Design a protein around this ligand. Structure first.
Ligand code: CRV
Length: 217
């Protein structure tokens, strides 16, 4: 496998989004993963509707909109629904709304998703290298996470109890420190312009490799 990967260099990553006070991290993680696939399949980079998932991938999928959800069930919703609208056609309002999906605004589809084996960082590396960006859950409950500004994030108090949905868009090493390149959804002002480099191959740090999954078109 290549020593480093950055899907932003292949134009497969849309710009960082800001979820606001709505717990839609899972929805942003899911669309971000599909956005890369759509780019690989059609050649067009398009932001997909996180709001679409918030309002429609609900109870039936075990999700609670602005109060949390799963990236995997979000993927299944897209498969079952036979589509997902573009962000432009179904804009993010940071609040729970009635489902307003309309196939005339469909911007992507999904045929299946894959959940990687628990905590295998090498397997995650392979997926990121050969498949594309991967949705993952990380433990982001620690004060240090919120205050992260640069370098490689390592928190002694992190655990494998994930609670925040994000997107791994690459990996590499910075000054002798291996890391996973993570796209967050707290706006471009968080970390390094919306991104955070988290410790890689450090005992599944913050549970980043605990529950990885990626969709396919
Ligand atoms: C992000 N804004 C938000 N967190 C979640 O929605 C969170 C994402 S996750 O990656 O931890 C989901 C996950 C957990 C365990 C194993 C694989 C994936 N999901 C939360 C959640 C899930 C389902 C419902 O119905 C509500 C909430 C939780 F509880 F799992 F962390 C809100 C902060």
């Amino acid at each position: 496998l290549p020593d480093s990967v950055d899907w932003r260099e292949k134009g497969c990553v849309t710009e960082v989004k800001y979820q606001g006070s709505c717990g839609a991290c899972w929805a942003f993680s899911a669309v971000g993963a599909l956005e890369a696939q759509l780019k690989l399949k059609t050649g067009k980079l398009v932001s997909l509707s996180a709001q679409n998932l918030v309002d429609c991938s609900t109870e039936k999928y075990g999700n609670k909109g602005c109060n949390g959800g799963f990236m995997t069930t979000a993927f299944q919703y897209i498969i079952d629904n036979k589509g997902i609208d573009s962000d432009a056609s179904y804009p993010y309002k940071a609040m729970d709304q009635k489902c307003q999906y309309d196939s005339k605004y469909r911007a992507a589809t999904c045929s299946k998703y894959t959940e990687l084996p628990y905590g295998r960082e090498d397997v995650l590396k392979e997926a990121v290298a050969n498949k594309g960006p991967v949705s993952v859950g990380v433990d982001a409950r620690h004060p240090s996470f919120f205050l992260y500004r640069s370098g490689v994030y390592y928190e002694p108090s992190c655990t494998q109890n994930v609670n925040h949905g994000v997107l791994v868009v690459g990996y590499g090493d910075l000054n002798g420190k291996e890391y996973w390149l993570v796209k967050n959804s707290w706006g471009h002002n968080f970390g390094e312009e919306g991104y955070i480099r988290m410790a890689r191959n450090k005992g599944n740090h913050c549970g980043i490799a605990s529950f990885p999954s990626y969709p396919e078109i």
